[PDB]
């Protein structure tokens, strides 16, 4: 049972970041402003 | 990416790329070359230049030739149909029998299996050969040194190991031909076709052949062992088999690495070997292991240069060896086959914690009795063969019956000799030698313990002497 | 489990971005990366490559930085970005490492998750000076009769295990690690010994089986294993001993007692020779660099014994050296003999002749020695050593044969000091001078079982007192004579 | 905090997996059968799911009186 659990977890992790594989720079500008504050 | 050759110095070739540099250990293919010339990246010199070593002849290379990058180190065709088939470092068929229509290609230069993938219990690989499974047992995922020569039959021992491991277990075999003489390679090909290990007309071949001959550049002779290792790793990691990988000489692997590092301009070390001798041997031998998926057991013929066992090449190879079989010509002159020297053959798994106290004690007793027989032999050289000791001649005949019982008919030698090939399980070997040590088979004559299987065949023969 | 992912791995995920200092790889090759940039990088500072690899800033040059790559240079290309870490090369230390198998950089390779270490310690620290140290006094018990009697090892010592291949050096170290279980489970916290086993250039299967032997004996719970095996990069096999030594210096500095095994130092010297020759440095004897002595001596000098003003801790080192054909007058063997405090010569003649452990008593020495024995072991082992010297001189003779067969021992069988003292007593007072030799071991076995099954009180008194008093002397005398009458 | 609201959408997608035990694979099974094969093979060699029934054997004995 624990080995099946670990292997299902592994396939889930590579599938979730395959999901990101299939998938807006407002955060980029925000980080820019933050770094500008970092002087 | 596509680069251009900017330097050709013997077997090293410096290429220059415009946009995408290939990483180290990557196969570049030269364009326009009539054959398939493959360079392997060994260095990044800067200025977008890349130093490589060629896997073939470099004649006719022009500064400016187009060199196309592949992306993978070197991809050889792996699959269940490389068996009974010859290929070279690049993975192309050598045997003039058509292409290898396999399904997948594996890259050479893999990583040794992780720590957590190592199986942790030492286990004997039963080979069905009496003298080996009794006195110097092979370990699963181990390395074995064949200290044989030409006179004593060594090709027969190799073919019989292939046959047994294929039958007892379900394991296929790979034979790497590092730095091998083309004449001897052809001889071995035809001997393995004859003895049925290779089948030219069926799909029942038990061995895949990989050869890097002596007329090939140091890069080839250095990567051919890795090619064989890759075609064995496929079987292990994708079929759960217990593969048997032979390396017809490991010293030529070492010396080819030495030549390669010399060509690249590196400063030599003790005696002249590469500075990376230990790591180059390790990155290869560490892939011959027993993983949780299967195992690869390696039989590596060893040449000892200048007969110095402290030379850096055999002294760095012996760090990886787990067993050792010595094919003496002296034992063969006595008429014993396989001519494995029972006293000079060693194994690291011989201790009672691994093979059990029963196996350990039977083998220890056989060893001690053989040593005492050679002692009583040099004292019989007195020419005064008498029996002022009852136990002395008792043990003399016991040990003669033993050292003849360490003889066995091999299946692969069933066409040359009418004797049938009798592979014997481990427990039957232990039991038979236990009986002969307990003094039971005294009434039996001597020659009924010659070219026999288990003791059942021995007593059947003894009866049939009349 | 699903939320073992969104656990904090997402929320707490270091998804920061910071103004980092960088360099650009000019040329990777021979395990060295010429890197352009890194203007403010420090000498011996750890940098991180684009592939997640790590390296040490060796050569600060005017126009570039030479970086030693801790891993395969296959994963580095020209043009890769190299970030500073601002930290001189250091490893995680602490008690959270006990039970863990790690590689030379402190990363777990046992699949049990990350090491929860809170402290980091530099790998290239300087050994303690003259004042912080104090002479070796406390015994470091190995559980091997031959070692614990004739070649005693104290806490804070450096004792070489030198010998050919396959002569039982790793077995001696593994038994020394297993033997500390009787102390680590007890009550006195000044007798606990935390063991560290650095495996350099070894077969990874051998290290896995070693961890198995330690787990079956329940010795992993107090043991760190640093593994830089045969297939790992030469810089990693170079670094592994200093990583292990810092993990042990953590215990040495906090009033605890560590033991460290380097298995072996010959392979670290070979890895350093590879690195030096690839750096085009001038090769000396046997092509070794000029500073291979410094290589081993700055390492074995950190195994000290602090005084009670610096915590009172210690760190014992058992470096292993493999000789070729029994040559001890080689370069690296004599270097480490110059560094350590003694040797344990294992012989191939003795090992092949069934004498295991194959310790050469005439050549094994311990410069500290007597100052770190118990009183009872001293009482019996003095006479044993005198009689063994007498026997090797004339090679009484029967007494010597009896004693040398009394020194044989089994693998994975470390004896407590009381039982070693009992056996050596039964051997050294003559009580088997007339028993023919081949039964001795048998007798020994039976005898000790007797003494442990029924006379536990005598052994307990020996344990409490440390010496074998006249009362206990006559008691053990009647015990052994009664058994011999029974035997 | 754009990438957390990235990730947990994907995590919820992966959660839609009671209809498919291993999240739309039709692969990674060919090796799981082999790995469990080894697993069962040497964890035992019987119907490990079951409870065991036990055959016992009892000692040998001989003539021990004065012959
Ligand atoms: N004290 C002992 N008693 C009996 N047998 C022993 C003893 N020590 C070792 N052996 C046996 O001899 C073998 C030697 O193995 P060991 O690892 O201890 O030697 P080594 O010096 O480390 O050789 P290597 O260089 O290969 O590591 C052991 O596997 C074991 O089977
Ligand atoms: Mg060892």
d(CA C405, CA B52): 60
Strands (E), C265-312: none
Q: What angle do CA B57, B62, B68 make, to 5 degrees?
A: 80
Does B267 contact C203 at a Cβ distance shorter than 8 Å?
Answer: no
Specify the CATH number of the domain B2-74.
2.40.10.170
Judge whether B41 and B65 are in contact, CB under 8 Å: no
For ligand 1, say whether the CB of C169 is within 6 Å of any of its atoms.
yes
> 3-state class of C435 per DSSP?
coil
Count Cβ atoms within 10 A of the Cβ of residue C335 and give its class: 0-12 exposed, 13-18 middle, 19 or more buried. buried
Which residues, 6+ apart, have CB-to-CB distance to B344 below 8 Å?
A: B147, B324, B326, B328
d(CA C204, CA C62): 41
Which residues, 6+ apart, have CB-to-CB distance to C466 below 8 Å?
A: C374, C375, C376
Dihedral (C-alpha) C272, C273, C278, C281: value to the nearest 10 degrees? 110
Give phi and psi for B219, each to the nearest 5. Answer: -65, -45
Neighbours of B10 (CB within 10 A): 11
Which residues, 6+ apart, have CB-to-CB distance to B177 below 8 Å?
A: B185, B209, B210, B211, B212, B213, B224, B248
The residue numbers preceding gaps of C to N over 2.5 A in chain A are 23
For ligand 1, say whether the CB of C209 is within 6 Å of any of its atoms.
no
Do chain C and D touch: 3 or more Cβ pairs under 8 angstroms?
yes
Q: What is the CA radius of gyration of chain B?
A: 25
d(CA B167, CA B418): 21
Does C19 contact A38 at a Cβ distance shorter than 8 Å?
Answer: yes
Q: Do the domains B357-464 and B75-347 match in fold?
A: no
A17 reaches D (C-beta below 8 A): yes
Sheet holding B173-180, edge to edge: B86-87, B207-213, B173-180, B242-247, B295-301, B143-146, B323-325, B346-347
d(CA C260, CA C246): 10
The topology (CATH level 3) of B75-347 is Rossmann fold (3.40.50)
Q: Which of B44, B279, B348 sits opposite C234 (nearest CB)?
A: B279
Judge whether B147 and B323 are in contact, CB under 8 Å: no
Q: Which residues of D33-58 are buried (b: 16+ CB within 10 A; e: fewer)?
A: eeeeeeeeeeeeeeeeeeeeeeeeee
Does A5 contact C5 at a Cβ distance shorter than 8 Å?
Answer: no
Judge whether C236 and C104 are in contact, CB under 8 Å: yes
For ligand 1, say whether the CB of C241 is within 6 Å of any of its atoms.
no
Q: What angle do CA B455, B458, B462 make, to 5 degrees?
A: 145
For ligand 1, say whether the CB of C352 is within 6 Å of any of its atoms.
no
Does D21 contact A8 at a Cβ distance shorter than 8 Å?
Answer: yes
**Tokens read off for B186:** 């052809």
Instruction: Tell me how far the alpha carbon of residue B349 is from its chain's centroid.
Output: 18
Does A13 contact C4 at a Cβ distance shorter than 8 Å?
Answer: no
Question: To which H or E segment does residue B427 belong?
Answer: helix B426-438
d(CA C10, CA D7): 8
d(CA B160, CA B327): 14
Helices (H), B112-181: 130-135, 155-168
Nearest atom (ligand 1) to Cα of C164? 21
C175 reaches B (C-beta below 8 A): no
**Tokens read off for B145:** 């040194």
Q: Nearest to residue C222, comparing CAs of C270, C189, C253?
A: C189
Question: To which H or E segment does residue B179 belong?
Answer: strand B173-180
The verdict on whether B181 is a catalytic residue reads: yes
Cis peptide before A6 (omega within 30 of 0): no
d(CA B331, CA B340): 7
Q: Which residues of B279-297 are buried (b: 16+ CB within 10 A; e: fewer)?
A: bbbbbbbbbbbbbbbbbbb
Q: Is B284 left (phi over 0), alpha (psi -120 to 50) or beta?
A: alpha
> 3-state class of C140 per DSSP?
coil
Q: What is the resolution of this structure in A?
A: 2.8
**Centre of ligand 1 from the C-alpha of residue C442, in Å:** 22
Q: Which of C30, C74, C286 sits opposite B266 (nearest CB)?
A: C30
User: Token match 């009798």: residue?
Assistant: B422
Q: Nearest to residue C295, comparing CAs of C234, C204, C232?
A: C234
Does A16 contact C5 at a Cβ distance shorter than 8 Å?
Answer: yes
Which residues, 6+ apart, have CB-to-CB distance to C312 below 8 Å?
A: C255, C306
**Tokens read off for C24:** 């650009």
What is the secondary structure of B40-58 as a DSSP string?
EEEEEEETTEEEEEESS--
**Tokens read off for C396:** 């009484």
Q: What is the DSSP letter of B91?
A: -
**Chain C residues inside the 8 Å CB shell of A31:** 17
In chain B, where the domains are located: 2-74, 75-347, 357-464
Neighbours of C5 (CB within 10 A): 17
> 3-state class of C106 per DSSP?
coil
Nearest atom (ligand 1) to Cα of C166? 23
d(CA C334, CA C389): 25
d(CA B457, CA B465): 12
Judge whether C223 and C198 are in contact, CB under 8 Å: no
For ligand 1, say whether the CB of C170 is within 6 Å of any of its atoms.
yes
Neighbours of D65 (CB within 10 A): 4
Count Cβ atoms within 10 A of the Cβ of residue B111 and give its class: 0-12 exposed, 13-18 middle, 19 or more buried. exposed
Neighbours of C282 (CB within 10 A): 10
> 3-state class of C254 per DSSP?
coil
Count Cβ atoms within 10 A of the Cβ of residue C317 and give its class: 0-12 exposed, 13-18 middle, 19 or more buried. buried
Q: Which of A3, A11, A23 sits opposite D39 (nearest CB)?
A: A3
d(CA C79, CA C67): 14
Helices (H), A1-39: 2-22, 26-37
d(CA B145, CA B347): 10
A32 reaches D (C-beta below 8 A): no
> 3-state class of C28 per DSSP?
strand
Count Cβ atoms within 10 A of the Cβ of residue C466 and give its class: 0-12 exposed, 13-18 middle, 19 or more buried. middle
**Which residues of C does the annotation place in the binding site for Mg(2+)?**
170, 263
How far from B332 is each of B17, B130, B337, B407, CA to CA, in Å? 59, 16, 7, 10
Helices (H), B68-207: 130-135, 155-168, 182-194
Judge whether C25 and C77 are in contact, CB under 8 Å: yes
Which residues, 6+ apart, have CB-to-CB distance to C121 below 8 Å?
A: C90, C91, C93, C246, C247, C249, C250
**Tokens read off for C366:** 């311990």
d(CA D35, CA B239): 11
d(CA C246, CA C106): 11
Q: Which of D4, D14, D15 sits opposite C10 (nearest CB)?
A: D4
Does C287 contact B270 at a Cβ distance shorter than 8 Å?
Answer: yes
**Chain A residues inside the 8 Å CB shell of C19:** 35, 38
Residue closest via CA to ligand 1's atom 16 equals C168
Q: What is the DSSP letter of B283?
A: H
Which residues, 6+ apart, have CB-to-CB distance to C80 below 8 Å?
A: C24, C25, C28, C49, C50, C51
Judge whether B205 and B84 are in contact, CB under 8 Å: yes
Q: How many Cα atoms occupy the beta-carbon half-sphere of C426 within 13 Å? A: 29
Count Cβ atoms within 10 A of the Cβ of residue C240 and give its class: 0-12 exposed, 13-18 middle, 19 or more buried. buried
Which residues, 6+ apart, have CB-to-CB distance to B308 below 8 Å?
A: B314
Q: Nearest to residue B159, comparing CAs of B424, B434, B413?
A: B413
Q: What angle do CA C43, C44, C45 make, to 5 degrees?
A: 95
Which residues pair with residue B4 across a beta bridge? B16, B66
Residue A28: closest C-alpha in chain C = C17
A20 reaches D (C-beta below 8 A): yes
- This entry's atomic model was obtained through cryo-EM
User: Which residues are found with C-beta within 5 Å of the ion, ligand 2?
Assistant: C 170
Judge whether B259 and B265 are in contact, CB under 8 Å: no
d(CA D30, CA D35): 9
**Tokens read off for B346:** 């060693």
Cis peptide before C357 (omega within 30 of 0): yes
d(CA C404, CA C387): 10
Q: How many Cα atoms occupy the beta-carbon half-sphere of C184 within 13 Å? A: 21
Q: What is the largest CA-CA distance in chain D?
A: 95
d(CA B234, CA B79): 7
Specify the CATH number of the domain B357-464.
1.10.1140.10
Shortest-distance ligand to the CA of residue C262? 2
Residue pairs spanning C and D at CB distance below 8 A: 13
Residue closest via CA to ligand 1's atom 9 equals C168
Q: Are strands C257-263 and C314-322 parallel, antiparallel or unpaired?
A: parallel
Q: Nearest to residue B125, comparing CAs of B117, B114, B136, B115?
A: B136
Q: What is the DSSP letter of B187?
A: H
d(CA B293, CA B289): 11
Mutate to test the pocket of ligand 1, among C170, C171, C326 (most ligand atoms within 8 A of CB): C171
Neighbours of D60 (CB within 10 A): 5
**Tokens read off for B204:** 């029942």
What is the secondary structure of B230-271 as a DSSP string?
HHHHHHHHHH--EEEEEES-SHHHHHHHHHHHHHTTPPP-GG
Judge whether C104 and C237 are in contact, CB under 8 Å: yes
For an interface test with A, the pick among C3, C5, C15, C20 (most A C-beta atoms closer than 10 Å) comes out as C5
Residue C3: closest C-alpha in chain A = A9
Judge whether C428 and C477 are in contact, CB under 8 Å: no
Q: Nearest to residue C246, comparing CAs of C398, C93, C356?
A: C93
Nearest atom (ligand 1) to Cα of C144? 1
Place domain C91-376 in its CATH homologous superfamily. P-loop containing nucleotide triphosphate hydrolases (3.40.50.300)
Count Cβ atoms within 10 A of the Cβ of residue C83 and give its class: 0-12 exposed, 13-18 middle, 19 or more buried. middle
**Centre of ligand 1 from the C-alpha of residue C316, in Å:** 22
User: Token match 């014994």: residue?
Assistant: C305
Residues B181, B364, B422, B431: which is the catalytic one? B181
Dihedral (C-alpha) C273, C278, C280, C286: value to the nearest 10 degrees? 30
Question: To which H or E segment does residue C226 belong?
Answer: strand C223-228
Does C5 contact A35 at a Cβ distance shorter than 8 Å?
Answer: no
């Amino acid at each position: 049972q624990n080995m099946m659990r670990r292997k299902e977890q592994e396939h889930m992790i590579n599938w979730v970041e395959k999901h990101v594989v299939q998938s807006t720079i407002a955060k980029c500008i925000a980080d820019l402003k933050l770094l500008a504050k970092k002087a | 990416a596509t680069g251009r050759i900017v330097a050709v110095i013997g077997a090293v070739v410096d290429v220059q790329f415009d946009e995408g540099l290939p990483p180290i250990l990557n196969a570049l293919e030269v364009q326009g070359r009539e054959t398939r010339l493959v360079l392997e990246v060994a260095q990044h010199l800067g200025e977008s230049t890349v130093r490589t070593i060629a896997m073939d002849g470099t004649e006719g290379l022009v500064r400016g030739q187009k060199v196309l990058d592949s992306g993978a180190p070197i991809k050889i065709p792996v699959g269940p149909e490389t068996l009974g088939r010859i290929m070279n470092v690049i993975g192309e068929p050598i045997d003039e029998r058509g292409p290898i229509k396999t399904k997948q290609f594996a890259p050479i230069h893999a990583e040794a299996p992780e720590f957590m993938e190592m199986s942790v219990e030492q286990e004997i690989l039963v080979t069905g050969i009496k003298v080996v499974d009794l006195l110097a047992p092979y370990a699963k995922g181990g390395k074995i040194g064949l200290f044989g020569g030409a006179g004593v039959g060594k090709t027969v021992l190799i073919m019989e190991l292939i046959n047994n491991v294929a039958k007892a277990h379900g394991g296929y075999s790979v034979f790497a031909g590092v730095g091998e003489r083309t004449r001897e390679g052809n001889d071995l090909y035809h001997e393995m076709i004859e003895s049925g290990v290779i089948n030219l007309k069926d799909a029942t071949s038990k061995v895949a052949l990989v050869y890097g001959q002596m007329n090939e550049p140091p890069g080839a002779r250095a990567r051919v062992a890795l090619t064989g290792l890759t075609v064995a790793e496929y079987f292990r990691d994708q079929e759960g088999q217990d593969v048997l990988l032979f390396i017809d000489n490991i010293f030529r692997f070492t010396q080819a690495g030495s030549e390669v590092s010399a060509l690249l301009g590196r400063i030599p070390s003790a005696v002249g070997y590469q500075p990376t001798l230990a790591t180059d041997m390790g990155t290869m031998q560490e892939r011959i292991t027993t993983t949780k998926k299967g195992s690869i057991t390696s039989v590596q013929a060893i040449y000892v240069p200048a007969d110095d066992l402290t030379d850096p090449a055999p002294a760095t190879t012996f760090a990886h060896l787990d067993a050792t079989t010595v094919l003496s010509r002296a034992i063969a002159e006595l008429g014993i086959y396989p001519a494995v020297d029972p006293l000079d053959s060693t194994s690291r798994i011989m201790d009672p914690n691994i093979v059990g106290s029963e196996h350990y004690d039977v083998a220890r007793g056989v060893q001690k009795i053989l040593q005492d027989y050679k002692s009583l032999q040099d004292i019989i050289a007195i020419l005064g063969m008498d029996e002022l000791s009852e136990e002395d001649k008792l043990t003399v005949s016991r040990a003669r019956k033993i050292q003849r019982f360490l003889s066995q008919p091999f299946q692969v030698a069933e066409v040359f000799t009418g004797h049938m090939g009798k592979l014997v399980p481990l427990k039957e070997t232990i039991k038979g030698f236990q009986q002969i040590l307990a003094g039971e088979y005294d009434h039996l004559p001597e020659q009924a313990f010659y070219m026999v299987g288990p003791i059942e065949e021995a007593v059947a023969k003894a009866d049939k002497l009349a | 489990e699903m939320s073992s992912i969104l656990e904090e791995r997402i929320l707490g995920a270091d998804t920061s971005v910071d103004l980092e200092e960088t360099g650009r790889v000019l040329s990777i090759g021979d395990g060295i990366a010429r890197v352009h940039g890194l203007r403010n990088v420090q000498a011996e500072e750890m940098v991180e490559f684009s592939s997640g690899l790590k390296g040490m800033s060796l050569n600060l040059e005017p126009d570039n930085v030479g970086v030693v790559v801790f891993g395969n240079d296959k994963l580095i290309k020209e043009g890769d970005i190299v970030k500073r870490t601002g930290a001189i090369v250091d490893v995680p230390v602490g008690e959270e490492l006990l039970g863990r198998v790690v590689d030379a950089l402190g990363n777990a390779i046992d699949g049990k998750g990350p090491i929860g270490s809170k402290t980091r310690r530099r790998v290239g620290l300087k050994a303690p000076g003259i004042i912080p140290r104090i002479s070796v006094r406390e015994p470091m018990q190995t559980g091997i009769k031959a070692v614990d009697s004739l070649v005693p090892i104290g806490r804070g010592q450096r004792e070489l295990i030198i010998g050919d291949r396959q002569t039982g050096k790793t077995s001696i170290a593994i038994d020394t690690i297993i033997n500390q279980k009787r102390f680590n489970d007890g009550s006195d916290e000044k007798k606990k010994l935390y063991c560290i086993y650095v495996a350099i250039g070894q077969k990874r299967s051998t290290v896995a089986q070693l961890v198995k032997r330690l787990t079956d004996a329940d010795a992993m719970k107090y043991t760190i294993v640093v593994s830089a095996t045969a297939s790992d990069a030469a810089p990693l096999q170079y670094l592994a001993p200093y990583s292990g030594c810092s993990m042990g210096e953590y215990f040495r500095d906090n009033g605890k007692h560590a033991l460290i095994i380097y298995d072996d130092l010959s392979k670290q010297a070979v890895a350093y020779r590879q690195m030096s020759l690839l750096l085009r440095r001038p090769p000396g004897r046997e092509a070794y660099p000029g500073d291979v002595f410094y290589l081993h001596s700055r390492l074995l000098e950190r195994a000290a014994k602090m005084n009670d003003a610096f915590g009172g801790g210690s760190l014992t080192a058992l470096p292993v050296i493999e000789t070729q054909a029994g040559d001890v007058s080689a370069y690296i063997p004599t270097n480490v003999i110059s560094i350590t405090d003694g040797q344990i010569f294992l012989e191939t003649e003795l090992f092949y002749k069934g004498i295991r452990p194959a310790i050469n008593v005439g050549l094994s020495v311990s410069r500290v020695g007597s100052a770190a024995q118990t009183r009872a072991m001293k009482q019996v082992a003095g006479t044993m050593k005198l009689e063994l010297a007498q026997y090797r001189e004339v090679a009484l003779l029967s007494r010597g044969v009896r004693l040398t067969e009394l020194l044989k021992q089994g693998q994975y069988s470390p004896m407590a000091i009381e039982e070693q003292v009992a056996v050596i007593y039964a051997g050294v007072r003559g009580y088997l001078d007339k028993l023919e030799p081949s039964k001795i071991t048998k007798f020994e076995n039976a005898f000790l079982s007797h003494v442990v099954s029924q006379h536990q009180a005598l052994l307990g008194t020996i344990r409490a007192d440390g010496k074998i008093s006249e009362q206990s002397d006559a008691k053990l005398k009647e015990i052994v004579t009664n058994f011999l009458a029974g035997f | 905090q754009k990438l957390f609201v990235d990730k947990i959408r994907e995590y919820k997608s992966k959660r839609q997996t009671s209809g498919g035990p291993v999240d739309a694979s039709s692969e990674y099974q060919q090796e799981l059968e082999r790995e469990l094969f080894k697993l069962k093979q040497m964890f035992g060699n019987a119907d490990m799911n079951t409870f065991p029934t036990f055959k016992f054997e009892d000692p040998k004995f001989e003539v021990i009186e004065k012959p």
